[PDB]
């Protein structure tokens, strides 16, 4: 099951933090800092499957951003990596070639997209097209 | 002459760097972060020689300032340059802290370009650089002890009682590690003694966070100034998460010969000096539930199997430093259950070592009595480090 | 409109100092508190904007001590945006005021009672995200009824399934042994694939503790798997992902099948077997897209199917096919696939049926280890080599490990040395090979080998091995290098001192040459090494009279008689006195045969 | 990965839009934000052209900021910085010569083979300039050009101009010129190291009184390269360098001490200057230790060599080297070594007073070094060994484990140094038998029992106590126990016979140690053949031990004296060791 989801940058400033397991605020900050320290060291040639505490992290780079999902030691890694890419594609199509800043001015939209695609630490929906249709019909409603 | 100038925080990340000689690359930064800040086996020294690289490091509050060189340069001149640059930076933007450094990157680049001219430490006069530098920085703005206590012989015992917690991957990568400890000061003193207690800089003021909670009677200004209450009391409690010297290193190897056989070999290595001796070594190796029988062999200590706990218990009375021992167990498994292979819980071990796993060593401890002439020389001081094991588990 | 949030964020991100940012945050918090403290209540849009601002402030890491009253008041609003923002703010900030829990429970009950799918979906999302004990006690009996309701649409069914998942994970005792098992099991036949995904996740979680309850789902799942793999490229157009039909659903179905033993019905077993080799053959096909993403998506299903085959461990042909497919992945330009294939082959090496197939790939595993960059991949390859090593190919694997050691780095030498020592322990048949391998390992990386290893090699050399000449020759050829270090020096000193007479015929191994080598070693040796070398020296005094004279000048200098360490000085005194006083008869007497120890 | 890369809108697009703003204040703000983003790791390379478009501005703040930006790229990747040489070369008629200095040093930052053609003319035309800072930057740029291994035939004229820079009005200019010349002259080409000694030395010494502190460091370090030929010149140089006691904590003082020690070749019989120089070299080295811990460490490492070479300078200054509590550990250890080196016959009465006080401190390894220092003092002076033994027994009676262990370790060495002189002590040490667990202390106690065995009536019981747990002990302890038991058997035959079998037929065959097995078998054979030879081979008169620890190679010592002020003294290693 998914432990937490993070969208970070090279500067270390968190931009999205979804927590599916209970933690304290200082504990969350410590975990975010350690995740950033682990992710930023590795280069492109290195693997994307990094063990981290009693969990592991699946991460990918998109220009000026890092996407990381923390999963259990016994979950299929490539499935979650492709889920990361699918979430990125959904964001990109929904925000019309989303930039880094668009994850801040529309942070609640990012949260609702994550909740639509991810829930209870698992993958909810996988089809980009009708997820986008759901998001547009949601946006149309006032 | 002077290779490059680096400025780091307590965590070890490069706050701001500037190199002047092309022969120095990321290797110098990596070496300084690994073997200087995170040094464990070496006593701290201002100058460090690493693979033909000389490091001059100065600590101010919680900021490291490093000069990297590859030539034979005047050490005193380099240290004086570092001191003068620290003074100039303090003059421009007050206290030297992480927030202040991060607030004035432009001005720090300005200074490193002006005073440090390609390894040449030029003048660092505050009044001289005002014309030379244009940018300006941004500044940031009794009850617990009685009177008349008497003792025949003044004494005090310090016990640094630490517990190390670790979760290790089978390949040797340290997944999680921290140390939670306390200081017990059993002091039998007469009068109203003022105690100064100075330490090294290893402590900075479901998961662990680095923190340090003091007692009510202490005061801070490095140094701890207090008045010890009569009897036994806990000076402080703390929980560190970085730079933990590890008294033991466990390598498990499991081979599944088919389904009716298992071969588990566990090698324990001691990562401390040969003088120190670790006592009360207990290694708990998990065993599959459907265990028909076990053949367990060791060349050191004693070992046996417990079906009450379903585990191999390996007891070693004492272990020296920089030594390696192995346990080999051949387990015969009866496939009473069909499939659904047995999940292996981590291998655990308990130990006691006479040295703090956090690297803490007490530097100085004085008692000063303004009422009676006796001083720190007249009092008998005992120091005892005891580091036990908490959840010390390595995955197999 | 939504202009205050953008201006506030722009002002926050443009602050030059952290103190200025803190001042701005405090000013905004004070303004919001003053606005809400006023008696005159305003429209819901201002409250929505201020709640969103509070949420943004909390996201920056600051502490918020209020804001929940208007957060609850926003839930009762029929405008969707206000309800969504209020629910998000409640989910992010967990509150412990029992009156607030009562308010949110009442609001969620009202939302669920409503027939609007969006509002009930938001309520389910909030319950799943928060998942506290109070919410579980409130809605544990209510969620399954929503799950099995025939009038509820697909998205709400997915949300309710995942909410029940969360409740079961946080509150095991509040999910009863209900009668909704049949309906949730039969829900896997829904046309909407996302509902199938949610139900599959729920069944995978629930079947961990209740196997006998959800067994009937297994066969059904298999059917869906077939309908996922036999579909054409124009089928499941919504649920396609780079020319792959529903990868995630396939993976989850494979995990669900992994949660259960093989089915007893031969028909469903045959169907799932056909699906398995269908997946394997589809993987064997050339890629339909040159992009890495499609390959990753397909290989996800491939690896999960391989894991399912390993877990079942019933089809030798399937295991052989999986081993061959994994072996095709070692020479893959990508690194993630190589790491996953190495891990899966290490898992396979523990099965009797596929052991031969694992051993078939010994050469490609060695080549992958030799030409890899990442340390983790190398470690996994070495672990696989240790797992697959056996008496049939122990010599080849050990030789390749030593050959790698000749050019290896320090990040893997410890593990390689330890594994080589253990393999030499377990699979030694002839003494000559064992002695040669141990001596070569010493010469290469003695600084990491244990003390017991070179105690044991010397012991086995001493007792009975009739390879003393070869051992001495190997030691002498090792000792003539500048890269030697301490343990090699010790073992070489002992072996030479005991069997230097066997290689005295060779002019290149004259006693003077041996002494020159040992004296060159002395410059960089420790105290016990020096003591062992002095013992070897007196052995040579007894054995080689021709060199004996030049030994005395060695045992009279200030380095020996005036040594700071007591042990070396005492050894030097004893050996000088033995060499000088008496004659060669005493030294011959002190050098006996040392018969081998009894064997039990 | 085209995602999150589009430049139509985003942080990079906003920064680019702000960079093109007409108002200069917003342009400066944008440049500051760009520099901050680069520093924090964000890739802002796509903003490189636009900021280069900011070059042609009359404002100096923006020009300086873009200079720092370009220098920041200069050391990261030179290729990116190459694309700005066209704007760099505009360095002819621009006023405010600090701009010229910044430009020429920016060329100094970039290290490519393509920069030589475009830098030769500006460097040649900026060396001869009225502004002193341009001369400074030209002087350092000549050295940075000479850093690479190439001919650049204009380099001959470059060095000619650099040598001509010695006769300049501003002391800082000549200081930088001589520092650059020193950094260039580490390798000697065909035409260098000319014999222009007299006039250059006269000019350097005339300017030294007006140079900046770092300039004084450079000149005095360059003076260490010179070697004198006449004693009058050496005396004049020494008497002109002596007043160097400036505000510099150690740099000026240490470099001047280096120069004075190098220029020490005279006669004391008729010239009353050698003694006076040795007298006034003391106060500077004494006042060096009143600064900061790191500077104190460097000064202590230099004072170690100074004392080792000529001990008579610091003969009567043992008081200043007393360890303060607040100093760090390295300063404590170096001060301990200095105290040990200076332990003369007259100061011991207070030295053992201090070293006894240091053994009650709460620092474990420092107390260990203090008791080892007590032992070193005992070894150095034979007339004060009794006081050292009394102090060591006093420390022993304190009953602190980490003190007792190394105290008895030192007692072993003292007994070795002066055998049969402290017999009455040994019995007291017998009380501390069960309080030893460290291998060193246990080995020392076992050896102490082995020797002088006839003076202990219960030594058999002491050895039997350790023999029970023979295994699980270090190799040193096992070997020392074997040697002690064999020694005591010959001294005490027919009472400890049972020990011989228990140690040889049980503690040798069972042990897997090869060297220990050889020792056991040799001891068995010697004792079985004839005890007459065993007594004279085992109990031979052990000669004394040399105190070579507090001694260094005279040639190496001379080299370190030739390199007092630099890192060689701090490491105590030749410069050739670390090339």
Author numbering:
A (entry chain S): 1 to 142
B (entry chain M): 1 to 141, 159 to 222, 240 to 255, 261 to 435
C (entry chain A): 9 to 608
D (entry chain B): 4 to 582
Task: Quote the paper.
The AP2 complex, composed of α, β2, μ2, and σ2 subunits, is pivotal to mammalian CCV formation, and its deletion is embryonically lethal in mice. We dissect the network of interactions between the FCHO interdomain linker and AP2, which concentrates, orients, tethers, and partially destabilizes closed AP2 at the plasma membrane.
A His10 affinity tag placed at the C terminus of N3 allowed us to ensure that purified material contained full-length N1-N3 linker using a Ni–nitrilotriacetic acid (NTA) agarose recapture step. A key residue known to latch β2 and Cu2 together in the phi pocket, β2Val365, is no longer occluded in the FCHO-enriched SPA reconstruction of AP2:μ2FCHO2-N1+N2+N3 when compared to AP2 alone, further supporting a destabilization of “closed” AP2 when FCHO2 is bound. No EM density for N3 was present in any of our reconstructions. In conclusion, significant conformational variability was present in the AP2:μ2FCHO2-N1+N2+N3 chimera as compared to apo AP2 (14), with conformations ranging from closed through part open to a fully open bowl connected to a randomly positioned Cμ2. We have been unable to visualize N1+N2+N3 simultaneously bound to closed AP2.
